[PDB]
PDB file of all heavy atoms in Angstrom:
ATOM      1  N   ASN A   9     103.908 -40.889 -72.417  1.00  0.00           N
ATOM      2  CA  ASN A   9     103.119 -42.102 -72.484  1.00  0.00           C
ATOM      3  C   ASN A   9     101.624 -41.808 -72.394  1.00  0.00           C
ATOM      4  O   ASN A   9     101.120 -41.288 -71.331  1.00  0.00           O
ATOM      5  CB  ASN A   9     103.528 -43.083 -71.334  1.00  0.00           C
ATOM      6  CG  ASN A   9     102.789 -44.353 -71.364  1.00  0.00           C
ATOM      7  OD1 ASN A   9     102.019 -44.705 -72.315  1.00  0.00           O
ATOM      8  ND2 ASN A   9     103.014 -45.209 -70.323  1.00  0.00           N
ATOM      9  N   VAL A  10     100.903 -41.979 -73.482  1.00  0.00           N
ATOM     10  CA  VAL A  10      99.490 -41.702 -73.545  1.00  0.00           C
ATOM     11  C   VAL A  10      98.536 -42.959 -73.662  1.00  0.00           C
ATOM     12  O   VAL A  10      97.272 -42.821 -73.542  1.00  0.00           O
ATOM     13  CB  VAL A  10      99.163 -40.768 -74.796  1.00  0.00           C
ATOM     14  CG1 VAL A  10      99.909 -39.439 -74.658  1.00  0.00           C
ATOM     15  CG2 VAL A  10      99.445 -41.456 -76.094  1.00  0.00           C
ATOM     16  N   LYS A  11      99.112 -44.088 -73.867  1.00  0.00           N
ATOM     17  CA  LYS A  11      98.269 -45.322 -73.941  1.00  0.00           C
ATOM     18  C   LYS A  11      97.326 -45.514 -72.804  1.00  0.00           C
ATOM     19  O   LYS A  11      97.741 -45.622 -71.657  1.00  0.00           O
ATOM     20  CB  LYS A  11      99.169 -46.567 -74.097  1.00  0.00           C
ATOM     21  CG  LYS A  11      98.371 -47.719 -74.804  1.00  0.00           C
ATOM     22  CD  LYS A  11      98.989 -49.067 -74.487  1.00  0.00           C
ATOM     23  CE  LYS A  11     100.291 -49.284 -75.317  1.00  0.00           C
ATOM     24  NZ  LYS A  11      99.987 -50.276 -76.427  1.00  0.00           N
ATOM     25  N   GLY A  12      96.036 -45.458 -73.106  1.00  0.00           N
ATOM     26  CA  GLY A  12      95.047 -45.620 -72.069  1.00  0.00           C
ATOM     27  C   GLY A  12      94.825 -44.418 -71.134  1.00  0.00           C
ATOM     28  O   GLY A  12      94.123 -44.535 -70.115  1.00  0.00           O
ATOM     29  N   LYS A  13      95.238 -43.287 -71.575  1.00  0.00           N
ATOM     30  CA  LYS A  13      95.116 -42.043 -70.782  1.00  0.00           C
ATOM     31  C   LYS A  13      94.196 -41.109 -71.414  1.00  0.00           C
ATOM     32  O   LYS A  13      94.081 -41.058 -72.682  1.00  0.00           O
ATOM     33  CB  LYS A  13      96.434 -41.326 -70.661  1.00  0.00           C
ATOM     34  CG  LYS A  13      97.630 -42.104 -70.194  1.00  0.00           C
ATOM     35  CD  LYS A  13      97.579 -42.247 -68.693  1.00  0.00           C
ATOM     36  CE  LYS A  13      98.818 -43.030 -68.240  1.00  0.00           C
ATOM     37  NZ  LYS A  13      98.727 -43.414 -66.835  1.00  0.00           N
ATOM     38  N   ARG A  14      93.577 -40.298 -70.608  1.00  0.00           N
ATOM     39  CA  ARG A  14      92.676 -39.244 -71.096  1.00  0.00           C
ATOM     40  C   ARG A  14      93.673 -38.038 -71.195  1.00  0.00           C
ATOM     41  O   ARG A  14      94.457 -37.728 -70.322  1.00  0.00           O
ATOM     42  CB  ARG A  14      91.635 -38.928 -70.057  1.00  0.00           C
ATOM     43  CG  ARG A  14      90.512 -39.944 -70.004  1.00  0.00           C
ATOM     44  CD  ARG A  14      89.584 -39.709 -68.811  1.00  0.00           C
ATOM     45  NE  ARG A  14      90.394 -39.525 -67.597  1.00  0.00           N
ATOM     46  CZ  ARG A  14      90.144 -38.559 -66.679  1.00  0.00           C
ATOM     47  NH1 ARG A  14      89.103 -37.795 -66.830  1.00  0.00           N
ATOM     48  NH2 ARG A  14      91.001 -38.369 -65.624  1.00  0.00           N
ATOM     49  N   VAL A  15      93.768 -37.443 -72.411  1.00  0.00           N
ATOM     50  CA  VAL A  15      94.642 -36.346 -72.663  1.00  0.00           C
ATOM     51  C   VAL A  15      93.895 -34.999 -72.698  1.00  0.00           C
ATOM     52  O   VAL A  15      92.959 -34.863 -73.490  1.00  0.00           O
ATOM     53  CB  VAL A  15      95.446 -36.512 -74.015  1.00  0.00           C
ATOM     54  CG1 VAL A  15      96.310 -35.288 -74.303  1.00  0.00           C
ATOM     55  CG2 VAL A  15      96.242 -37.764 -74.095  1.00  0.00           C
ATOM     56  N   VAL A  16      94.239 -34.098 -71.805  1.00  0.00           N
ATOM     57  CA  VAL A  16      93.639 -32.823 -71.755  1.00  0.00           C
ATOM     58  C   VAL A  16      94.617 -31.848 -72.515  1.00  0.00           C
ATOM     59  O   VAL A  16      95.747 -31.666 -72.072  1.00  0.00           O
ATOM     60  CB  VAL A  16      93.272 -32.299 -70.297  1.00  0.00           C
ATOM     61  CG1 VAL A  16      94.553 -32.241 -69.423  1.00  0.00           C
ATOM     62  CG2 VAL A  16      92.574 -30.927 -70.317  1.00  0.00           C
ATOM     63  N   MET A  17      94.178 -31.387 -73.693  1.00  0.00           N
ATOM     64  CA  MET A  17      95.069 -30.614 -74.530  1.00  0.00           C
ATOM     65  C   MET A  17      94.602 -29.163 -74.857  1.00  0.00           C
ATOM     66  O   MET A  17      93.533 -28.972 -75.365  1.00  0.00           O
ATOM     67  CB  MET A  17      95.248 -31.340 -75.852  1.00  0.00           C
ATOM     68  CG  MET A  17      96.296 -30.724 -76.776  1.00  0.00           C
ATOM     69  SD  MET A  17      96.429 -31.551 -78.331  1.00  0.00           S
ATOM     70  CE  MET A  17      97.027 -33.177 -77.963  1.00  0.00           C
ATOM     71  N   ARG A  18      95.460 -28.253 -74.514  1.00  0.00           N
ATOM     72  CA  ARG A  18      95.262 -26.861 -74.816  1.00  0.00           C
ATOM     73  C   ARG A  18      95.694 -26.623 -76.211  1.00  0.00           C
ATOM     74  O   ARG A  18      96.857 -26.949 -76.555  1.00  0.00           O
ATOM     75  CB  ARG A  18      96.013 -25.927 -73.881  1.00  0.00           C
ATOM     76  CG  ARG A  18      95.245 -24.689 -73.362  1.00  0.00           C
ATOM     77  CD  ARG A  18      94.979 -23.698 -74.509  1.00  0.00           C
ATOM     78  NE  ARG A  18      94.387 -22.497 -73.967  1.00  0.00           N
ATOM     79  CZ  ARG A  18      93.837 -21.555 -74.752  1.00  0.00           C
ATOM     80  NH1 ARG A  18      93.868 -21.629 -76.050  1.00  0.00           N
ATOM     81  NH2 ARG A  18      93.367 -20.447 -74.221  1.00  0.00           N
ATOM     82  N   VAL A  19      94.897 -26.085 -77.066  1.00  0.00           N
ATOM     83  CA  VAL A  19      95.258 -25.772 -78.479  1.00  0.00           C
ATOM     84  C   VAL A  19      94.837 -24.355 -78.721  1.00  0.00           C
ATOM     85  O   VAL A  19      94.076 -23.760 -77.983  1.00  0.00           O
ATOM     86  CB  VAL A  19      94.470 -26.712 -79.516  1.00  0.00           C
ATOM     87  CG1 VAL A  19      95.027 -28.162 -79.366  1.00  0.00           C
ATOM     88  CG2 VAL A  19      92.986 -26.682 -79.257  1.00  0.00           C
ATOM     89  N   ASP A  20      95.496 -23.720 -79.699  1.00  0.00           N
ATOM     90  CA  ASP A  20      95.091 -22.323 -80.026  1.00  0.00           C
ATOM     91  C   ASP A  20      94.236 -22.463 -81.290  1.00  0.00           C
ATOM     92  O   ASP A  20      94.802 -22.548 -82.432  1.00  0.00           O
ATOM     93  CB  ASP A  20      96.318 -21.517 -80.312  1.00  0.00           C
ATOM     94  CG  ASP A  20      95.937 -19.984 -80.379  1.00  0.00           C
ATOM     95  OD1 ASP A  20      94.902 -19.708 -81.072  1.00  0.00           O
ATOM     96  OD2 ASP A  20      96.623 -19.095 -79.866  1.00  0.00           O
ATOM     97  N   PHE A  21      92.950 -22.543 -81.120  1.00  0.00           N
ATOM     98  CA  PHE A  21      91.936 -22.588 -82.218  1.00  0.00           C
ATOM     99  C   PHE A  21      91.268 -21.202 -82.408  1.00  0.00           C
ATOM    100  O   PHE A  21      90.236 -21.124 -82.986  1.00  0.00           O
ATOM    101  CB  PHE A  21      90.847 -23.630 -81.811  1.00  0.00           C
ATOM    102  CG  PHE A  21      91.202 -25.055 -82.160  1.00  0.00           C
ATOM    103  CD1 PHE A  21      90.429 -26.082 -81.749  1.00  0.00           C
ATOM    104  CD2 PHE A  21      92.332 -25.369 -82.884  1.00  0.00           C
ATOM    105  CE1 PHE A  21      90.646 -27.373 -82.049  1.00  0.00           C
ATOM    106  CE2 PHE A  21      92.660 -26.724 -83.206  1.00  0.00           C
ATOM    107  CZ  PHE A  21      91.815 -27.704 -82.772  1.00  0.00           C
ATOM    108  N   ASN A  22      91.939 -20.189 -81.766  1.00  0.00           N
ATOM    109  CA  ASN A  22      91.413 -18.820 -81.892  1.00  0.00           C
ATOM    110  C   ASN A  22      91.609 -18.392 -83.362  1.00  0.00           C
ATOM    111  O   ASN A  22      92.453 -17.614 -83.655  1.00  0.00           O
ATOM    112  CB  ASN A  22      92.166 -17.866 -80.976  1.00  0.00           C
ATOM    113  CG  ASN A  22      91.688 -16.451 -81.056  1.00  0.00           C
ATOM    114  OD1 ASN A  22      90.571 -16.149 -81.466  1.00  0.00           O
ATOM    115  ND2 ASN A  22      92.504 -15.494 -80.614  1.00  0.00           N
ATOM    116  N   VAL A  23      90.796 -18.983 -84.208  1.00  0.00           N
ATOM    117  CA  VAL A  23      90.871 -18.720 -85.646  1.00  0.00           C
ATOM    118  C   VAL A  23      90.081 -17.548 -86.057  1.00  0.00           C
ATOM    119  O   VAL A  23      89.094 -17.142 -85.397  1.00  0.00           O
ATOM    120  CB  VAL A  23      90.372 -19.977 -86.459  1.00  0.00           C
ATOM    121  CG1 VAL A  23      91.266 -21.178 -86.242  1.00  0.00           C
ATOM    122  CG2 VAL A  23      88.937 -20.259 -86.053  1.00  0.00           C
ATOM    123  N   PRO A  24      90.457 -16.924 -87.219  1.00  0.00           N
ATOM    124  CA  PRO A  24      89.718 -15.759 -87.701  1.00  0.00           C
ATOM    125  C   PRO A  24      88.417 -16.342 -88.160  1.00  0.00           C
ATOM    126  O   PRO A  24      88.329 -17.585 -88.568  1.00  0.00           O
ATOM    127  CB  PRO A  24      90.559 -15.237 -88.838  1.00  0.00           C
ATOM    128  CG  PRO A  24      91.635 -16.199 -89.114  1.00  0.00           C
ATOM    129  CD  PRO A  24      91.672 -17.189 -87.930  1.00  0.00           C
ATOM    130  N   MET A  25      87.343 -15.579 -88.142  1.00  0.00           N
ATOM    131  CA  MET A  25      86.109 -15.964 -88.675  1.00  0.00           C
ATOM    132  C   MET A  25      85.414 -14.762 -89.272  1.00  0.00           C
ATOM    133  O   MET A  25      85.972 -13.698 -89.373  1.00  0.00           O
ATOM    134  CB  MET A  25      85.267 -16.414 -87.470  1.00  0.00           C
ATOM    135  CG  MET A  25      85.919 -17.588 -86.739  1.00  0.00           C
ATOM    136  SD  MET A  25      84.866 -19.002 -86.459  1.00  0.00           S
ATOM    137  CE  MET A  25      83.798 -18.654 -85.136  1.00  0.00           C
ATOM    138  N   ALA A  26      84.165 -15.006 -89.777  1.00  0.00           N
ATOM    139  CA  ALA A  26      83.385 -14.002 -90.492  1.00  0.00           C
ATOM    140  C   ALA A  26      82.002 -14.626 -90.658  1.00  0.00           C
ATOM    141  O   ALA A  26      81.855 -15.707 -91.221  1.00  0.00           O
ATOM    142  CB  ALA A  26      83.996 -13.661 -91.795  1.00  0.00           C
ATOM    143  N   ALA A  27      80.985 -13.894 -90.156  1.00  0.00           N
ATOM    144  CA  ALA A  27      79.587 -14.369 -90.184  1.00  0.00           C
ATOM    145  C   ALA A  27      79.391 -15.844 -90.082  1.00  0.00           C
ATOM    146  O   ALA A  27      79.139 -16.557 -91.084  1.00  0.00           O
ATOM    147  CB  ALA A  27      78.891 -13.812 -91.462  1.00  0.00           C
ATOM    148  N   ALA A  28      79.677 -16.401 -88.889  1.00  0.00           N
ATOM    149  CA  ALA A  28      79.645 -17.787 -88.506  1.00  0.00           C
ATOM    150  C   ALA A  28      80.247 -18.693 -89.512  1.00  0.00           C
ATOM    151  O   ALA A  28      79.755 -19.734 -89.954  1.00  0.00           O
ATOM    152  CB  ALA A  28      78.214 -18.229 -88.248  1.00  0.00           C
ATOM    153  N   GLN A  29      81.570 -18.387 -89.801  1.00  0.00           N
ATOM    154  CA  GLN A  29      82.339 -19.140 -90.730  1.00  0.00           C
ATOM    155  C   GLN A  29      83.809 -18.858 -90.521  1.00  0.00           C
ATOM    156  O   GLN A  29      84.213 -17.776 -90.232  1.00  0.00           O
ATOM    157  CB  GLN A  29      82.021 -18.688 -92.180  1.00  0.00           C
ATOM    158  CG  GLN A  29      81.468 -19.730 -93.085  1.00  0.00           C
ATOM    159  CD  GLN A  29      81.322 -19.281 -94.483  1.00  0.00           C
ATOM    160  OE1 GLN A  29      80.711 -19.965 -95.375  1.00  0.00           O
ATOM    161  NE2 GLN A  29      81.874 -18.115 -94.859  1.00  0.00           N
ATOM    162  N   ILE A  30      84.601 -19.956 -90.571  1.00  0.00           N
ATOM    163  CA  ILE A  30      86.062 -19.893 -90.340  1.00  0.00           C
ATOM    164  C   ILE A  30      86.655 -19.358 -91.671  1.00  0.00           C
ATOM    165  O   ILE A  30      86.261 -19.785 -92.772  1.00  0.00           O
ATOM    166  CB  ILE A  30      86.579 -21.294 -90.092  1.00  0.00           C
ATOM    167  CG1 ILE A  30      85.855 -21.891 -88.880  1.00  0.00           C
ATOM    168  CG2 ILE A  30      88.101 -21.277 -89.847  1.00  0.00           C
ATOM    169  CD1 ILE A  30      85.817 -23.417 -88.858  1.00  0.00           C
ATOM    170  N   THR A  31      87.615 -18.435 -91.591  1.00  0.00           N
ATOM    171  CA  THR A  31      88.240 -17.836 -92.754  1.00  0.00           C
ATOM    172  C   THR A  31      89.690 -18.279 -92.897  1.00  0.00           C
ATOM    173  O   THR A  31      90.312 -17.905 -93.904  1.00  0.00           O
ATOM    174  CB  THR A  31      88.181 -16.248 -92.686  1.00  0.00           C
ATOM    175  OG1 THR A  31      88.826 -15.753 -91.493  1.00  0.00           O
ATOM    176  CG2 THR A  31      86.715 -15.827 -92.645  1.00  0.00           C
ATOM    177  N   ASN A  32      90.209 -19.078 -92.014  1.00  0.00           N
ATOM    178  CA  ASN A  32      91.553 -19.623 -92.064  1.00  0.00           C
ATOM    179  C   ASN A  32      91.718 -20.736 -91.000  1.00  0.00           C
ATOM    180  O   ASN A  32      91.614 -20.507 -89.838  1.00  0.00           O
ATOM    181  CB  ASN A  32      92.652 -18.485 -91.849  1.00  0.00           C
ATOM    182  CG  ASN A  32      94.093 -18.968 -91.863  1.00  0.00           C
ATOM    183  OD1 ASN A  32      94.320 -20.137 -91.681  1.00  0.00           O
ATOM    184  ND2 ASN A  32      94.952 -18.100 -92.225  1.00  0.00           N
ATOM    185  N   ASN A  33      92.075 -21.960 -91.523  1.00  0.00           N
ATOM    186  CA  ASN A  33      92.217 -23.163 -90.732  1.00  0.00           C
ATOM    187  C   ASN A  33      93.556 -23.369 -90.043  1.00  0.00           C
ATOM    188  O   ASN A  33      93.641 -24.025 -88.989  1.00  0.00           O
ATOM    189  CB  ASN A  33      92.026 -24.392 -91.618  1.00  0.00           C
ATOM    190  CG  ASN A  33      90.667 -24.514 -92.188  1.00  0.00           C
ATOM    191  OD1 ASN A  33      90.476 -25.323 -93.110  1.00  0.00           O
ATOM    192  ND2 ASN A  33      89.690 -23.835 -91.707  1.00  0.00           N
ATOM    193  N   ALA A  34      94.538 -22.834 -90.679  1.00  0.00           N
ATOM    194  CA  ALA A  34      95.997 -22.935 -90.200  1.00  0.00           C
ATOM    195  C   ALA A  34      96.137 -23.453 -88.802  1.00  0.00           C
ATOM    196  O   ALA A  34      96.870 -24.536 -88.621  1.00  0.00           O
ATOM    197  CB  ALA A  34      96.673 -21.558 -90.256  1.00  0.00           C
ATOM    198  N   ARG A  35      95.630 -22.808 -87.826  1.00  0.00           N
ATOM    199  CA  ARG A  35      95.836 -23.158 -86.372  1.00  0.00           C
ATOM    200  C   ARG A  35      95.240 -24.524 -86.010  1.00  0.00           C
ATOM    201  O   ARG A  35      95.741 -25.276 -85.175  1.00  0.00           O
ATOM    202  CB  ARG A  35      95.243 -22.037 -85.458  1.00  0.00           C
ATOM    203  CG  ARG A  35      96.171 -20.800 -85.483  1.00  0.00           C
ATOM    204  CD  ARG A  35      95.976 -19.925 -84.236  1.00  0.00           C
ATOM    205  NE  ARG A  35      96.931 -18.802 -84.165  1.00  0.00           N
ATOM    206  CZ  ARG A  35      96.724 -17.663 -83.528  1.00  0.00           C
ATOM    207  NH1 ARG A  35      95.522 -17.466 -82.839  1.00  0.00           N
ATOM    208  NH2 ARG A  35      97.607 -16.652 -83.431  1.00  0.00           N
ATOM    209  N   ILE A  36      94.084 -24.859 -86.667  1.00  0.00           N
ATOM    210  CA  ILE A  36      93.430 -26.108 -86.463  1.00  0.00           C
ATOM    211  C   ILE A  36      94.265 -27.255 -87.023  1.00  0.00           C
ATOM    212  O   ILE A  36      94.593 -28.252 -86.392  1.00  0.00           O
ATOM    213  CB  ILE A  36      92.002 -26.144 -87.094  1.00  0.00           C
ATOM    214  CG1 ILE A  36      91.151 -25.032 -86.602  1.00  0.00           C
ATOM    215  CG2 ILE A  36      91.324 -27.498 -86.809  1.00  0.00           C
ATOM    216  CD1 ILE A  36      89.735 -25.023 -87.213  1.00  0.00           C
ATOM    217  N   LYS A  37      94.702 -27.073 -88.329  1.00  0.00           N
ATOM    218  CA  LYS A  37      95.513 -28.003 -88.996  1.00  0.00           C
ATOM    219  C   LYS A  37      96.882 -28.175 -88.332  1.00  0.00           C
ATOM    220  O   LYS A  37      97.474 -29.297 -88.309  1.00  0.00           O
ATOM    221  CB  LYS A  37      95.661 -27.631 -90.481  1.00  0.00           C
ATOM    222  CG  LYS A  37      94.349 -27.787 -91.293  1.00  0.00           C
ATOM    223  CD  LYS A  37      94.638 -27.449 -92.796  1.00  0.00           C
ATOM    224  CE  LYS A  37      95.140 -25.976 -92.930  1.00  0.00           C
ATOM    225  NZ  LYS A  37      95.413 -25.619 -94.367  1.00  0.00           N
ATOM    226  N   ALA A  38      97.384 -27.090 -87.829  1.00  0.00           N
ATOM    227  CA  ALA A  38      98.690 -27.049 -87.168  1.00  0.00           C
ATOM    228  C   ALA A  38      98.655 -27.957 -85.933  1.00  0.00           C
ATOM    229  O   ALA A  38      99.711 -28.516 -85.451  1.00  0.00           O
ATOM    230  CB  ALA A  38      99.098 -25.650 -86.767  1.00  0.00           C
ATOM    231  N   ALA A  39      97.516 -28.206 -85.330  1.00  0.00           N
ATOM    232  CA  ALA A  39      97.421 -29.012 -84.076  1.00  0.00           C
ATOM    233  C   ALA A  39      97.051 -30.430 -84.318  1.00  0.00           C
ATOM    234  O   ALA A  39      97.154 -31.299 -83.408  1.00  0.00           O
ATOM    235  CB  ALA A  39      96.496 -28.363 -83.093  1.00  0.00           C
ATOM    236  N   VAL A  40      96.590 -30.776 -85.575  1.00  0.00           N
ATOM    237  CA  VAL A  40      96.195 -32.157 -85.919  1.00  0.00           C
ATOM    238  C   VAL A  40      97.357 -33.197 -85.678  1.00  0.00           C
ATOM    239  O   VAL A  40      97.052 -34.302 -85.202  1.00  0.00           O
ATOM    240  CB  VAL A  40      95.673 -32.262 -87.344  1.00  0.00           C
ATOM    241  CG1 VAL A  40      95.425 -33.654 -87.819  1.00  0.00           C
ATOM    242  CG2 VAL A  40      94.344 -31.473 -87.415  1.00  0.00           C
ATOM    243  N   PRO A  41      98.646 -32.956 -86.050  1.00  0.00           N
ATOM    244  CA  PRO A  41      99.659 -33.937 -85.830  1.00  0.00           C
ATOM    245  C   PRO A  41      99.682 -34.430 -84.375  1.00  0.00           C
ATOM    246  O   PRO A  41      99.939 -35.572 -84.054  1.00  0.00           O
ATOM    247  CB  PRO A  41     100.908 -33.260 -86.297  1.00  0.00           C
ATOM    248  CG  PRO A  41     100.549 -32.076 -87.019  1.00  0.00           C
ATOM    249  CD  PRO A  41      99.125 -31.704 -86.632  1.00  0.00           C
ATOM    250  N   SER A  42      99.537 -33.465 -83.470  1.00  0.00           N
ATOM    251  CA  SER A  42      99.530 -33.800 -82.035  1.00  0.00           C
ATOM    252  C   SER A  42      98.323 -34.676 -81.610  1.00  0.00           C
ATOM    253  O   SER A  42      98.444 -35.666 -80.869  1.00  0.00           O
ATOM    254  CB  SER A  42      99.552 -32.533 -81.180  1.00  0.00           C
ATOM    255  OG  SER A  42     100.832 -32.019 -81.049  1.00  0.00           O
ATOM    256  N   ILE A  43      97.082 -34.309 -82.061  1.00  0.00           N
ATOM    257  CA  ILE A  43      95.934 -35.004 -81.820  1.00  0.00           C
ATOM    258  C   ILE A  43      95.960 -36.453 -82.309  1.00  0.00           C
ATOM    259  O   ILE A  43      95.523 -37.435 -81.646  1.00  0.00           O
ATOM    260  CB  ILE A  43      94.687 -34.332 -82.463  1.00  0.00           C
ATOM    261  CG1 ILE A  43      94.510 -32.901 -81.936  1.00  0.00           C
ATOM    262  CG2 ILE A  43      93.366 -35.074 -82.277  1.00  0.00           C
ATOM    263  CD1 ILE A  43      93.406 -32.059 -82.618  1.00  0.00           C
ATOM    264  N   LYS A  44      96.499 -36.595 -83.503  1.00  0.00           N
ATOM    265  CA  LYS A  44      96.624 -37.887 -84.139  1.00  0.00           C
ATOM    266  C   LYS A  44      97.647 -38.824 -83.401  1.00  0.00           C
ATOM    267  O   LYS A  44      97.446 -39.973 -83.232  1.00  0.00           O
ATOM    268  CB  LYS A  44      97.050 -37.757 -85.572  1.00  0.00           C
ATOM    269  CG  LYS A  44      96.099 -36.917 -86.286  1.00  0.00           C
ATOM    270  CD  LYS A  44      96.639 -36.628 -87.664  1.00  0.00           C
ATOM    271  CE  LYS A  44      95.783 -37.347 -88.648  1.00  0.00           C
ATOM    272  NZ  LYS A  44      96.346 -38.703 -88.949  1.00  0.00           N
ATOM    273  N   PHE A  45      98.763 -38.165 -83.003  1.00  0.00           N
ATOM    274  CA  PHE A  45      99.775 -38.931 -82.246  1.00  0.00           C
ATOM    275  C   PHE A  45      99.095 -39.580 -81.044  1.00  0.00           C
ATOM    276  O   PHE A  45      99.306 -40.762 -80.717  1.00  0.00           O
ATOM    277  CB  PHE A  45     100.906 -37.990 -81.776  1.00  0.00           C
ATOM    278  CG  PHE A  45     101.910 -38.649 -80.888  1.00  0.00           C
ATOM    279  CD1 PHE A  45     103.028 -39.279 -81.452  1.00  0.00           C
ATOM    280  CD2 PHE A  45     101.658 -38.656 -79.568  1.00  0.00           C
ATOM    281  CE1 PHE A  45     103.932 -39.877 -80.562  1.00  0.00           C
ATOM    282  CE2 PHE A  45     102.609 -39.315 -78.696  1.00  0.00           C
ATOM    283  CZ  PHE A  45     103.724 -39.923 -79.193  1.00  0.00           C
ATOM    284  N   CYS A  46      98.264 -38.783 -80.340  1.00  0.00           N
ATOM    285  CA  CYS A  46      97.655 -39.318 -79.164  1.00  0.00           C
ATOM    286  C   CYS A  46      96.685 -40.501 -79.496  1.00  0.00           C
ATOM    287  O   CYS A  46      96.829 -41.549 -78.882  1.00  0.00           O
ATOM    288  CB  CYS A  46      96.779 -38.196 -78.407  1.00  0.00           C
ATOM    289  SG  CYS A  46      97.889 -36.924 -77.647  1.00  0.00           S
ATOM    290  N   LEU A  47      95.886 -40.261 -80.531  1.00  0.00           N
ATOM    291  CA  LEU A  47      94.903 -41.322 -80.882  1.00  0.00           C
ATOM    292  C   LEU A  47      95.614 -42.595 -81.383  1.00  0.00           C
ATOM    293  O   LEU A  47      95.274 -43.706 -80.956  1.00  0.00           O
ATOM    294  CB  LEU A  47      93.958 -40.778 -82.021  1.00  0.00           C
ATOM    295  CG  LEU A  47      93.003 -39.680 -81.599  1.00  0.00           C
ATOM    296  CD1 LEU A  47      92.202 -39.231 -82.822  1.00  0.00           C
ATOM    297  CD2 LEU A  47      92.070 -40.184 -80.501  1.00  0.00           C
ATOM    298  N   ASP A  48      96.616 -42.421 -82.274  1.00  0.00           N
ATOM    299  CA  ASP A  48      97.388 -43.528 -82.807  1.00  0.00           C
ATOM    300  C   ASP A  48      98.130 -44.275 -81.723  1.00  0.00           C
ATOM    301  O   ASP A  48      98.505 -45.474 -81.943  1.00  0.00           O
ATOM    302  CB  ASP A  48      98.348 -43.013 -83.890  1.00  0.00           C
ATOM    303  CG  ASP A  48      97.688 -42.569 -85.120  1.00  0.00           C
ATOM    304  OD1 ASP A  48      96.522 -42.805 -85.344  1.00  0.00           O
ATOM    305  OD2 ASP A  48      98.348 -41.983 -85.994  1.00  0.00           O
ATOM    306  N   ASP A  49      98.463 -43.640 -80.630  1.00  0.00           N
ATOM    307  CA  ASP A  49      99.211 -44.248 -79.559  1.00  0.00           C
ATOM    308  C   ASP A  49      98.340 -44.750 -78.452  1.00  0.00           C
ATOM    309  O   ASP A  49      98.812 -44.979 -77.318  1.00  0.00           O
ATOM    310  CB  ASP A  49     100.343 -43.382 -79.052  1.00  0.00           C
ATOM    311  CG  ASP A  49     101.559 -43.312 -79.953  1.00  0.00           C
ATOM    312  OD1 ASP A  49     101.498 -42.507 -80.948  1.00  0.00           O
ATOM    313  OD2 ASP A  49     102.538 -44.036 -79.730  1.00  0.00           O
ATOM    314  N   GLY A  50      97.101 -44.897 -78.729  1.00  0.00           N
ATOM    315  CA  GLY A  50      96.131 -45.461 -77.748  1.00  0.00           C
ATOM    316  C   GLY A  50      95.518 -44.579 -76.647  1.00  0.00           C
ATOM    317  O   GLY A  50      94.991 -45.119 -75.690  1.00  0.00           O
ATOM    318  N   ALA A  51      95.591 -43.333 -76.771  1.00  0.00           N
ATOM    319  CA  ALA A  51      94.952 -42.383 -75.800  1.00  0.00           C
ATOM    320  C   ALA A  51      93.462 -42.781 -75.604  1.00  0.00           C
ATOM    321  O   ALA A  51      92.829 -43.146 -76.570  1.00  0.00           O
ATOM    322  CB  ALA A  51      95.075 -40.941 -76.182  1.00  0.00           C
TER     323      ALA A  51
END
């Protein structure tokens, strides 16, 4: 139950990079369904 709650979420965004640029999003995109669920359910 997340409605009206502050959600503290650990995600693995330790993405590969190169000269101040992300080289693969996978891990960020992989965590979006969870972030949205929270928002859509009123967090």
Side-chain angles (χ1 to χ4, degrees):
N9 182 7
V10 301
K11 200 201 286 253
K13 306 281 182 190
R14 285 170 311 137
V15 178
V16 59
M17 191 185 292
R18 219 294 183 189
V19 291
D20 189 318
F21 276 171
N22 179 23
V23 295
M25 304 229 281
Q29 242 188 187
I30 304 154
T31 60
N32 180 336
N33 293 166
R35 285 201 175 157
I36 303 180
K37 289 183 299 181
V40 172
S42 276
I43 298 176
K44 305 173 108 268
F45 174 89
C46 291
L47 293 178
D48 288 350
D49 285 82

